[PDB]
Write a protein that binds this ligand. Structure first.
Ligand SMILES: Nc1cc(-n2ccnc2)c2c(F)ccc(O)c2n1
Length: 124
């Protein structure tokens, strides 16, 4: 079975909106979402659908852009670093679960480089 997906809301966690968090949704995530290699990362890994029964035996902190998008829409984050940390978890999950040079890793690496370019300059 799949685990429950990561939370996209939490009433105990304080919310915030910042210029940088608004940018991470409307520019960074919105652009990455349209990349031709974005599709494996637009929702939590469905280990049942994708026939990856070992995925959550290996990956204990799952993250994906669908979850990040909902968190940004929820104002779930306190600051941009918290959101950037989720992107980095998503990329590292792929590199942990898979081997260097695998097709899915090549996809993640293309997105990671675009991600790095986009957050190189954030609004003030
Ligand atoms: N080895 C794989 C295979 C995946 N996949 C792709 C199509 N069908 C299975 C996959 C994935 F969607 C998302 C994240 C991953 O890390 C994946 N890793």
């Amino acid at each position: 079975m799949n685990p429950p997906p990561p939370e996209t809301s939490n009433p105990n966690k304080p919310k915030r909106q910042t210029n940088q968090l608004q940018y991470l949704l409307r520019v960074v995530l919105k652009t990455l979402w349209k990349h031709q290699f974005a599709w494996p990362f637009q929702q939590p890994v469905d280990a049942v659908k994708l026939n990856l029964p070992d995925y959550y035996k290996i990956i204990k902190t799952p993250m994906d852009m669908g979850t990040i998008k909902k968190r940004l829409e929820n104002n779930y984050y306190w600051n941009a670093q918290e959101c950037i940390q989720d992107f980095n978890t998503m990329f590292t999950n792929c590199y942990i679960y898979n081997k260097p040079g695998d097709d899915i890793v090549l996809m993640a690496e293309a997105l990671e480089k675009l991600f790095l370019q986009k957050i190189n300059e954030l609004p003030t």
